[PDB]
């Protein structure tokens, strides 16, 4: 591709990423610094209750640790629909075989979720409820039984990922790259998938060089983070299997289980 | 950053050391696997009967166990060769001693499976310095847990070999693997990442110059480190299983210490 076509691709994805994801990294950072309506902090059991009364968190219609877990599931399901709409804007994506589109999203949404969750994290906690709340890392770590170690791997990824200091215009391309992974199981026609990823990778490379000229081999260092994402996804699955085998206060309305499957 | 002439000098240095440190190169392995070589033809082991003649021609346990111990013995020799190659990487021996050990502890197996790919095609693997060739089917047919220990390596090899790297490419890539700042327990991450930055720069230039028509080969190679990580994980699980089930069986001290955590 030509240099002007790569910038065009970059600007297109950035615009689409803005339309598809309400809470962008730039907005989340403003909130987390102290540079903008300040968020409601949840740092213990009592300030959780108060936050449910005042903000009426949609991830709270049980036991506290359970309700919080389930609330992350509710938000993940929301994120899936935002990512799915974003995918449709990727040039070439809707022209792929429909089963392949489903297959790419099925395996890619989780890597994307955690990529974008880092945008809402710092070393001390995570923004929730479209940025109206802030749940502290220490309050998450203090949840009983297996729920106390559910978010901590995400935080540890987030601190290292954020050190790369990507902005939304970088991330928009990076997210596209994740979706167009030709190595997903069951793909029927890998060749146009990798053709698109090649254009996205080229565009990501030029974008990082233009936007971070002083950050040597940021492109490679970003690609290596896809190892850290895949590992986090595998560990998450491990935690679910353990939860389903051990916790019985998990079951909800059967219709709820189907929504959250 | 570095100058082009410095990056070519680094690539030339590593390829030279790679030749000196690893007797059985990919180029040698492929010449043996292709043919038109009456002098280089291996003895082919495809069932229990041909294994017995192979003991006589190629040179008190059970077959599945002998085979598995064999691979462990050859993994030890590989660690030796990889260690010798690591000392040649500029900056490596200057690092904190504990970190050198940590980089090798977590690095060697990802390198073993990388270089094992060089000895493989979809139908089998060269053994005994290329004197033998063991079919993938005969390996898959081994009893108990040992029937599945090589198959993940084959599946990786098939996809890794599709990149068509040669030894000079692999010399830099192996260097990048060793100098991973993200290994657990590293004391001084920063001087490790400075080296890997120079190695990444050198690898990128090398791949562009050597495979000018292979678009984004650099990025595609970096994504292979996820497959490496997962093969290692699955091997670790198999060892824990063998330790609880095969009390006869012993391990080289070198491998025992690598495996500890
Ligand atoms: O491990 C997973 O599978 C997982 C975990 C969390 C999210 C996740 N949460 N989130 C919240 O901010 C949130 C909200 Cl909005 C309301 C209530 C609670 C939460 C929170 F506790 F989970 F944090 C997100 C916002 C954006 C995106 Cl992309 C992802 C998330 C996803 C997956
Ligand atoms: O699971 C692991 O961790 C593992 C497995 C195999 C090797 C391994 N074997 N090998 C053999 O030649 C061999 C022998 Cl000697 C006898 C029988 C079978 C084999 C072969 F099928 F595995 F190939 C190698 C040669 C070079 C290198 Cl670098 C690695 C190996 C290492 C680790």
């Amino acid at each position: 591709m030509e240099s002007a076509d790569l910038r065009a691709l970059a600007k297109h994805l950035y615009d689409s990423y803005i339309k598809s994801f309400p809470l962008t990294k730039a907005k989340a950072r403003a909130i987390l610094t102290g540079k903008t309506k300040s968020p409601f902090v949840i740092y213990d059991m009592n300030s959780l209750m108060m936050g449910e009364d005042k903000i009426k968190f949609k991830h709270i219609t049980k036991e506290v640790a359970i309700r919080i877990f389930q609330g992350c599931q509710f938000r993940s399901v929301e994120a899936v629909q935002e990512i799915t709409e974003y995918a449709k804007s990727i040039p070439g994506f809707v022209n792929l075989d429909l089963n392949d589109q489903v297959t790419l999203l099925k395996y890619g949404v989780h890597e994307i979720i955690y990529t974008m969750l880092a945008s809402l994290m710092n070393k001390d906690g995570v923004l929730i409820s479209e940025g109206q709340g802030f749940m502290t890392r220490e309050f998450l770590k203090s949840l009983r039984k297996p729920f106390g170690d559910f978010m901590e791997p995400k935080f540890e990824f987030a601190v290292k990922f954020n050190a790369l200091e990507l902005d939304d215009s970088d991330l928009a391309i990076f997210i596209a790259v994740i979706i167009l992974s030709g190595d997903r199981p069951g793909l029927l026609n890998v060749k146009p998938i990798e053709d698109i990823q090649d254009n996205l990778l080229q565009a990501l490379e030029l974008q990082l060089k233009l936007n971070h000229p002083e950050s040597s081999q940021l492109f490679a260092k970003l690609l290596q983070k896809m190892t850290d994402l895949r590992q986090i996804v595998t560990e998450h699955v491990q935690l679910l299997q353990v939860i389903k085998k051990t916790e019985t206060d998990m079951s909800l309305h059967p219709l709820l289980q189907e929504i959250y499957k």
Side-chain angles (χ1 to χ4, degrees), chain A residues 1-18 20-34 38-52 55 57-58 60-61 63-129 131-144 146-197 199-208 210-220 222-230 232-237 239-240 242-243 246-251 253-260:
Chain A
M1 302 246 294
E2 223 67 31
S3 166
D5 291 328
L6 295 171
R7 303 311 297 146
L9 188 53
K11 184 74 168 101
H12 178 80
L13 300 167
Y14 177 65
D15 293 330
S16 168
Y17 169 106
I18 291 295
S20 292
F21 306 106
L23 179 51
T24 83
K25 186 171 182 189
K27 323 254 207 69
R29 285 303 126 170
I31 298 157
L32 290 172
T33 56
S38 290
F40 178 94
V41 175
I42 293 170
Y43 53 96
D44 70 6
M45 292 296 185
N46 283 123
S47 53
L48 175 62
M49 309 219 306
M50 179 165 291
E52 315 193 339
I55 302 85
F57 299 131
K58 238 291 93 237
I60 317 282
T61 165
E63 173 183 58
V64 172
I66 283 142
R67 309 206 314 263
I68 298 185
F69 174 93
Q70 315 193 303
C72 305
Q73 285 314 318
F74 169 90
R75 170 69 183 121
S76 305
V77 166
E78 278 195 312
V80 170
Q81 295 303 139
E82 305 176 346
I83 300 159
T84 294
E85 183 193 300
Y86 181 66
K88 273 79 171 291
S89 86
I90 297 158
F93 183 83
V94 298
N95 302 323
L96 302 163
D97 183 290
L98 287 203
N99 305 114
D100 279 1
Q101 299 183 34
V102 169
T103 292
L104 290 169
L105 296 176
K106 170 165 169 62
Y107 293 96
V109 282
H110 276 91
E111 295 162 18
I112 294 183
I113 285 171
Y114 296 43
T115 298
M116 298 184 315
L117 182 68
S119 279
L120 318 182
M121 273 163 164
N122 63 25
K123 69 179 209 292
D124 300 310
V126 57
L127 292 175
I128 65 173
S129 170
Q132 286 168 312
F134 178 80
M135 192 172 286
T136 69
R137 177 177 194 179
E138 191 55 81
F139 170 64
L140 282 160
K141 226 147 100 174
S142 79
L143 293 181
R144 57 87 158 171
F147 299 103
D149 304 358
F150 168 98
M151 293 298 296
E152 192 60 20
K154 279 71 125 148
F155 281 116
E156 284 174 308
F157 171 74
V159 308
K160 259 205 85 173
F161 192 78
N162 292 344
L164 303 174
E165 304 183 353
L166 305 175
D167 59 29
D168 292 302
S169 65
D170 310 308
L171 289 167
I173 317 182
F174 181 55
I175 280 145
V177 168
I178 291 181
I179 297 176
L180 281 295
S181 292
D183 60 319
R184 307 292 192 187
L187 289 170
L188 292 177
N189 183 12
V190 180
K191 158 173 165 57
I193 293 171
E194 296 190 338
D195 286 8
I196 294 164
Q197 201 186 51
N199 301 265
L200 293 165
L201 287 165
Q202 285 182 71
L204 177 61
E205 185 172 30
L206 180 63
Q207 164 75 9
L208 296 172
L210 294 174
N211 192 27
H212 309 270
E214 84 297 347
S215 172
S216 193
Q217 292 295 299
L218 185 59
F219 178 59
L222 180 52
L223 298 173
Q224 303 176 269
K225 290 294 167 204
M226 268 179 293
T227 309
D228 302 61
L229 284 169
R230 301 244 183 150
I232 285 272
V233 176
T234 50
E235 290 174 36
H236 186 67
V237 168
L239 255 190
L240 295 188
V242 167
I243 287 169
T246 294
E247 304 278 326
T248 47
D249 204 4
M250 308 317 294
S251 58
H253 199 288
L255 282 193
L256 259 206
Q257 291 186 346
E258 284 294 322
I259 297 169
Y260 289 172

